Scaffold this active site. Structure first.
Site, PDB file in Angstrom:
ATOM      1  N   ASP A  39     -38.884 -41.976  35.159  1.00  0.00           N
ATOM      2  CA  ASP A  39     -37.327 -42.222  34.059  1.00  0.00           C
ATOM      3  C   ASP A  39     -36.395 -42.619  34.744  1.00  0.00           C
ATOM      4  O   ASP A  39     -36.677 -43.676  35.664  1.00  0.00           O
ATOM      5  CB  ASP A  39     -37.063 -40.925  34.221  1.00  0.00           C
ATOM      6  N   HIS A  69     -31.014 -37.736  31.687  1.00  0.00           N
ATOM      7  CA  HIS A  69     -32.430 -37.253  31.680  1.00  0.00           C
ATOM      8  C   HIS A  69     -33.645 -37.448  32.180  1.00  0.00           C
ATOM      9  O   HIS A  69     -34.339 -36.154  32.096  1.00  0.00           O
ATOM     10  CB  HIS A  69     -32.860 -38.438  30.586  1.00  0.00           C
ATOM     11  N   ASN A 161     -40.645 -39.997  19.056  1.00  0.00           N
ATOM     12  CA  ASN A 161     -39.897 -39.542  18.575  1.00  0.00           C
ATOM     13  C   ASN A 161     -39.214 -40.066  16.397  1.00  0.00           C
ATOM     14  O   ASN A 161     -37.898 -39.592  16.405  1.00  0.00           O
ATOM     15  CB  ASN A 161     -37.823 -39.513  18.911  1.00  0.00           C
ATOM     16  N   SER A 224     -39.621 -35.850  25.190  1.00  0.00           N
ATOM     17  CA  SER A 224     -39.185 -35.894  26.305  1.00  0.00           C
ATOM     18  C   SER A 224     -38.975 -35.038  26.743  1.00  0.00           C
ATOM     19  O   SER A 224     -40.224 -34.443  28.127  1.00  0.00           O
ATOM     20  CB  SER A 224     -38.091 -36.613  26.395  1.00  0.00           C
TER      21      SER A 224
END
Lengths: 279, 8
Positions: A39, A69, A161, A224
């Site tokens: 990530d 994140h 998404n 996520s």
């Protein structure tokens, strides 16, 4: 073992009826396994990681997480008060940027790295790799996910998404890896979760509390947040002897809760991640 | 990088 008043995500997984607030898991808690979080990086010094999370590779000027994140996902995977596999080993691969984005050419480089970096580490119970990133096809990215999977790593990726068919989004569309969709607290498919036949399993993804940068935490939503949930489960089950990295995702879907979700398009599996724990 | 916190 039982963590009381836990984040609903963790609870929903060790339960068979929603609306519960306790996470029942085996004391082993994923000890002896590894989860590479590809990530924006992990805030490795966060107290919740108990010195079990460590940066390993970067592709940008710095190695730390200046977004959050990544840390958030690393937390759900294996952090003391919020993770699934509370005693696992977390490795940080920064492929994304601090604004959240990153070039496919380097996302690929990141997956190739975990494939061999796994060979110098000490994870006797298996290796998992969580990819809470995506984009919008590329035969090259899918291909990299597959190679990663072929080398002996359980690859778990986000569905997307866009509230669309995941087949048009790359990490997700690769059949060989585990594509995770998102579900919400009332056993409903998150409004934003990609569906389709490429999807493998569904995990908690809406309003998920987890660790953040600056030694903080916060709730956020998305496929996520769902990916690390099953990544965690995958590692948890692997150190338990229940499944192997090559066959994990199949075991998770075979042993999942069937038909408990609503707002699931015809053609999409109706399975929720579940650890089958019994005192 | 998928989504939503202070952000992706």
């Amino acid at each position: 073992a039982a963590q009381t008043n836990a984040p609903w995500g963790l609870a929903r997984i060790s339960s068979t009826s929603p609306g519960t607030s306790t996470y029942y898991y085996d004391e082993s808690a994923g000890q002896g396994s590894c989860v590479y979080v590809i990530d924006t990086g992990i805030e490795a010094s966060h107290p919740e990681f108990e010195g079990r999370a460590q940066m390993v590779k970067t592709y940008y000027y710095s190695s730390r997480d200046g977004n959050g994140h990544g840390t958030h996902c690393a937390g759900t995977v294996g952090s003391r008060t919020y993770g699934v596999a509370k005693k696992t080993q977390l490795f940080g691969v920064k492929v994304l940027d601090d604004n959240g984005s990153g070039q496919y050419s380097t996302i690929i480089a990141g997956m190739d790295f975990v494939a061999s970096d796994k060979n110098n580490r000490n994870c006797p119970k298996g290796v998992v790799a969580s990819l809470s990133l995506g984009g919008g096809y590329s035969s090259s990215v899918n291909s990299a996910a597959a190679r990663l999977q072929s080398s002996g790593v359980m690859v778990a990726v986000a569905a997307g998404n866009n509230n669309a068919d995941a087949r048009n989004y790359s990490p997700a569309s690769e059949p060989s890896v585990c594509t995770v969709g998102a579900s919400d607290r009332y056993d409903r498919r998150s409004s934003f979760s990609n569906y389709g036949s490429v999807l493998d399993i569904f995990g908690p993804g809406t309003s998920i509390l987890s660790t953040w940068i600056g030694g903080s935490t916060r709730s956020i939503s998305g496929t996520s947040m769902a990916t690390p949930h099953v990544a965690g489960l995958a590692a948890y089950l692997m150190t338990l002897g229940k499944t192997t990295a090559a066959s994990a995702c199949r075991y998770i879907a075979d042993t999942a809760n069937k038909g408990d979700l609503s707002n699931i398009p015809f053609g999409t599996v109706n399975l929720l991640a579940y650890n089958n724990y019994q005192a | 990088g998928d989504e939503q916190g202070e952000n992706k």
